[PDB]
């Protein structure tokens, strides 16, 4: 008959390889089954002898350790892993990367925002939170996510790596750490430049060129909302701003500095996205497109449209303002 | 006992100081004097009781490891003290930088569990798992340091503007994380890159010098008189074994320089003095020529003595093997 929801129709399994996938349709159960399938379909369960019963418990534990913030919640976790999935196929990555690196990318994506409390490192630092004091103002959140991720994998029951050798686990841990830490936006400028310097003369042989490439990929996935179709990506803005406004109120209310780009009184749906798209997103994917030309049409495409769409929407917001003292 | 004689106050200014004489109370009184004397109490409006409570707390948070203990904390601080006088650093550094150097020396090894980062990672400990195999101890010590300065009754910085706190916090973090011996190679190279054409007005050149200075004070046991320095080597190995004994009975790797069966007092130090201590102090002497005769001098002697002793240790094995 109609089977249960956590059994995916081949139609789903098919549509899950795509960035056009609607992340909003599904509920935890199914997102978890979705992710679980990702690990079989990518040959990770086979090639690392992952216990399939462990793989489920891992994902339940991962889900539980994500918090219910407006933005930095399990669905974001899902989007990023799903987008990494989408790009494994789009960029034929399984050719260019070892199965270990694929495992790192996927596992990294999933774990990258674990137990995120809802307020960025600038709050953590300026408010001198336990986490800021603990990690000494060095990417405290990302360091924290990373820590949480491996606390989980240290449990025998959640340890998807339990049947990996120690030399392999070492190498995987080192890689996830690198990537998760790379999600810090303070380091965007820095990482983009290092990447852009290797792109002068890229070399898939070179381990350091590849490390950057992975860092770039996970960053691409971390902020990829606007690559998704307008209908899927429009509400995320309200989720982001809901969280960013939570922090700015708290910051105001505790006498702490307040970033203009998170200010309830200044930011509008459009002004949030235009600059972010034009100058962070596009230039990033522009470089990735050089390594992978197919990315232009799938990813830059929606971004240009989303740019245009918001740039206009801002003209109208401003036209309206102007009218209300004209 | 409680009060320091003016002889002692005098002696404290030199590396010749006998760290072994004093009990904790008196070392705290010594450390206390360093703060008034260097003019930190004055120039940062430190409440004089808070400075005492803080030092007491800092002491509460050092453990009784045979080596990485409060007295090591005292050795390193008191050596830094000595280096301000010997190198006349008060002319080359602001009082903030002095505050950082001192306060960082003191805190640099807080709550050291007795087993190095190499164990922390390999055993995959709480610390290693939390700090992501990234200077986990040195991160920890640092964090502990500010958990203390966060208590308002121990807050020697309570009357410093938030701007300065920030610059001290940064200073202090950089220096504590620099003590990690994994980065010895890196940091020494970074420094010699600058020494090609050093510049006291280049905050970057100084941030590196401060590092080399605290680094210097961390490992500077053999710079002291033989009577003073030799007890530490037993203390060091006591610790280093305690770890390899644990490393062995948990199936984890042991490095041969802590392997109870390969290591002697002499082999431990000949290498260290030669390729770590001397080279570092050779460069620091290009900036401060006075150093050679006060620091490189006893080091060469120690090297020469332990090399002599190694000849005798080896001769004994020519009577033992079968
Ligand atoms: C207002 C905000 N816009 C924005 N921020 C996004 C998006 C996705 N992730 N992020 C943030 C969440 C933390 C990682 C960057 C997105 O689609 N838009 C923004 C943040 C930083 C800058 Cl520099 C500019 C705009
Ligand atoms: C065996 C050990 N010798 C040694 N190690 C020392 C000393 C002082 N601190 N340290 C270590 C203890 C942790 C802070 C560096 C010292 O006087 N001798 C050693 C360690 C590393 C190398 Cl490369 C060579 C010898
Ligand atoms: Mg994050
Ligand atoms: Mg240390
Ligand atoms: Zn994220
Ligand atoms: Zn030390």
HEC readout, chain B: CCCCCHHHHHHCCCCCCCHHHCCHHHHHHHHHHHHHHHCHHHHCCCCHHHHHHHHHHHHHCCCCCCCCCHHHHHHHHHHHHHHHHHCCHHHHCCHHHHHHHHHHHHHCCCCCCCCCHHHHHHCCCHHHHHCCCCCHHHHHHHHHHHHHHHCHHHCCCCCCCHHHHHHHHHHHHHHHHHCCHHHHHHHHHHHHHHHCCCCCCCHHHHHHHHHHHHHHHHHCCCCCCHHHHHHHHHHHHHHHHHHHHHHHCCCCCCCCCCCCCCCCHHHHHHHHHHHHHHHHHHHHHHHCCHHHHHHHHHHHHHHHHHHHHHHHHHHHHCCCCC
Measured in whole angstroms, the distance separating CA B52 from the mean position of its chain's CA atoms is: 21
| Rounded Cα gap, residues A307 and A57, in angstroms | 40
For residues B109 and B68, the answer to whether their CB atoms sit within 8 Å is: yes
Q: How big is chain B, counted in residues? A: 322
C-alpha separations of A166 from A50, B38, B319 in Å: 15, 51, 43
From A184's Cα to the closest Cα of chain B, the distance in A is 15
Measured in whole angstroms, the distance separating CA A88 from the mean position of its chain's CA atoms is: 14
Structure tokens at A197: 């310097």
| A210 pocket-lining for ligand 1 (C-beta < 6 Å) | no
Sequence spans of domains, chain B: 1-322
A211 closest CA partner among A97, A287, A78, A112: A97
Q: How many CB pairs under 8 A join A and B?
A: 37
Contact: A135, B150; criterion CB under 8 Å: no
Residue B286: other Cβ atoms inside 10 A: 12
Torsion of Cα atoms, B165 then A262 then A227 then A45, to 10°: 50
Choose which residue among A190, A218, A223, A269 to substitute to test ligand 1 binding: the one with the highest number of ligand atoms within 8 A of its C-beta.
Answer: A223
Residue owning tokens 């974001």: A76
What is the distance in A from the centroid of ligand 2 to the CA of B258?
Answer: 10
| A142 pocket-lining for ligand 1 (C-beta < 6 Å) | no
Structure tokens at A173: 């841990």
A107 closest CA partner among A47, A179, A11, A164: A179
Q: Which CATH superfamily is domain A1-326 in?
A: 3'5'-cyclic nucleotide phosphodiesterase, catalytic domain (1.10.1300.10)
Longest CA–CA span in chain B (Å) reads 70
B240 closest CA partner among B252, B255, B253, B228: B255
Please state which of the four CATH numbers 3.40.50.150, 3.60.40.10, 1.10.1300.10, 3.40.30.10 is assigned to the domain occupying B1-322: 1.10.1300.10
Choose which residue among B137, B242, B268, B280 to substitute to test ligand 2 binding: the one with the highest number of ligand atoms within 8 A of its C-beta.
Answer: B268
Ligand nearest to the CA of A140: 3
Burial of B149 (0-12, 13-18, 19+ CB in 10 A): buried
| Rounded Cα gap, residues B218 and B216, in angstroms | 6
| B181 pocket-lining for ligand 2 (C-beta < 6 Å) | yes
Experimental method: X-ray
Residue B54: other Cβ atoms inside 10 A: 26
For residues A323 and A316, the answer to whether their CB atoms sit within 8 Å is: no
| Rounded Cα gap, residues A191 and A283, in angstroms | 13
B299 closest CA partner among B316, B284, B277: B277
Residues of B belonging to the active site? 68
Please report the sign of the dihedral spanned by the C-alpha atoms of residue A130, residue A134, residue A140, residue A142: negative
Q: Is B131 on the interface with A (CB under 8 A)?
A: yes
From the list B124, B133, B143, the residue facing A133 with the nearest CB is B143
Residue owning tokens 């990829």: A224
| Rounded Cα gap, residues B97 and B167, in angstroms | 9
Choose which residue among B272, B281, B302, B306 to substitute to test ligand 2 binding: the one with the highest number of ligand atoms within 8 A of its C-beta.
Answer: B272
Non-local (6+) Cβ contacts of A269 within 8 A are A237, A238, A241, A310, A313
HEC readout, chain A: CCCCCCCCCHHHHHHCCCCCCCHHHCCHHHHHHHHHHHHHHCCHHHHCCCCHHHHHHHHHHHHHHCCCCCCCCHHHHHHHHHHHHHHHHHCCHHHHCCHHHHHHHHHHHHHCCCCCCCCCHHHHHHCCCHHHHHHCCCCHHHHHHHHHHHHHHHCCCCCCCCCCCHHHHHHHHHHHHHHHHHCCHHHHHHHHHHHHHHHCCCCCCCHHHHHHHHHHHHHHHHCHHHHCCHHHHHHHHHHHHHHHHHHHHHHHHCCCCCCHHHCCCCCCHHHHHHHHHHHHHHHHHHHHHHHCCCHHHHHHHHHHHHHHHHHHHHHHHHHHHHHCCC
Non-local (6+) Cβ contacts of B12 within 8 A are B30, B33, B34, B78, B81
Q: Is B139 on the interface with A (CB under 8 A)?
A: yes
For residues B212 and B187, the answer to whether their CB atoms sit within 8 Å is: yes
Contact: B173, A137; criterion CB under 8 Å: yes
C-alpha separations of A121 from A126, A127, A273, B12 in Å: 8, 10, 21, 43
| Rounded Cα gap, residues A195 and A202, in angstroms | 9
C-alpha separations of B319 from B307, B312, B313, B315, B322 in Å: 19, 11, 10, 7, 9
**List of chain A residues whose C-beta atoms are within 8 Å of the C-beta of residue B131:** 135, 143, 147
* Residue among A40, A63, A72, A188 flagged as catalytic: A72
Structure tokens at A203: 């070399």
| Rounded Cα gap, residues B263 and B75, in angstroms | 24
Q: Is A147 on the interface with B (CB under 8 A)?
A: yes
Closest chain A residue by Cα to residue B136:
A135
- Residues tagged in the binding site annotation of A: 72-76, 112-113, 222, 244, 272-273
Q: Is B146 on the interface with A (CB under 8 A)?
A: yes
Given resolution (angstroms): 3.1
Structure tokens at B261: 């069966």
C-alpha separations of B177 from A136, A179, B62 in Å: 10, 22, 18
| Rounded Cα gap, residues A33 and B296, in angstroms | 66
């Amino acid at each position: 008959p109609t089977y249960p929801k956590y059994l995916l129709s081949p139609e789903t399994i098919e549509a899950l390889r795509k960035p056009t996938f609607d992340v909003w349709l599904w509920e935890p159960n199914e997102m978890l089954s979705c992710l679980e399938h990702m690990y079989h379909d990518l040959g990770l369960v086979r090639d690392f002898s992952i216990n399939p019963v462990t793989l489920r418990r891992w994902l339940f534990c991962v889900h539980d350790n994500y918090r219910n913030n407006p933005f930095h919640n399990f669905r974001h976790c899902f989007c990023v892993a799903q987008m990494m999935y989408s790009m494994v196929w789009l960029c034929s990555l399984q050719e260019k990367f070892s199965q270990t690196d694929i495992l790192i990318l996927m596992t990294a994506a999933i774990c990258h925002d674990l137990d995120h409390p809802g307020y960025n490192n600038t709050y953590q630092i300026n408010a001198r939170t336990e986490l800021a004091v603990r990690y000494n103002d060095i990417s405290p959140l990302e360091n924290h996510h990373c820590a949480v991720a491996f606390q989980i994998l240290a449990e025998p029951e959640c340890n998807i790596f339990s049947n990996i050798p120690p030399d392999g686990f070492k190498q995987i841990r080192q890689g996830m750490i690198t990537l998760i830490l790379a999600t810090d936006m303070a380091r965007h400028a820095e990482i983009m430049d290092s990447f852009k310097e290797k792109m002068e003369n890229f070399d898939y042989s070179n381990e350091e060129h590849m490390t950057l490439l992975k860092m770039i990929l996970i960053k691409c996935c971390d902020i990829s909302n606007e690559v998704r179709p307008m209908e899927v990506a429009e509400p995320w803005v309200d989720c982001l701003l809901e969280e960013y406004f939570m922090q700015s109120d708290r910051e105001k209310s505790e006498g702490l500095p307040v970033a203009p780009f998170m200010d309830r009184d200044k930011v509008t749906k459009a002004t949030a996205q235009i600059g972010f798209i034009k100058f962070v997103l596009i230039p990033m994917f522009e470089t990735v497109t050089k390594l992978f030309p197919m990315v232009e049409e799938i990813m830059l495409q929606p971004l240009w449209e989303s740019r245009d769409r918001y740039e206009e929407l801002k003209r109208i917001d401003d036209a309206m303002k102007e009218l209300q003292k004209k």
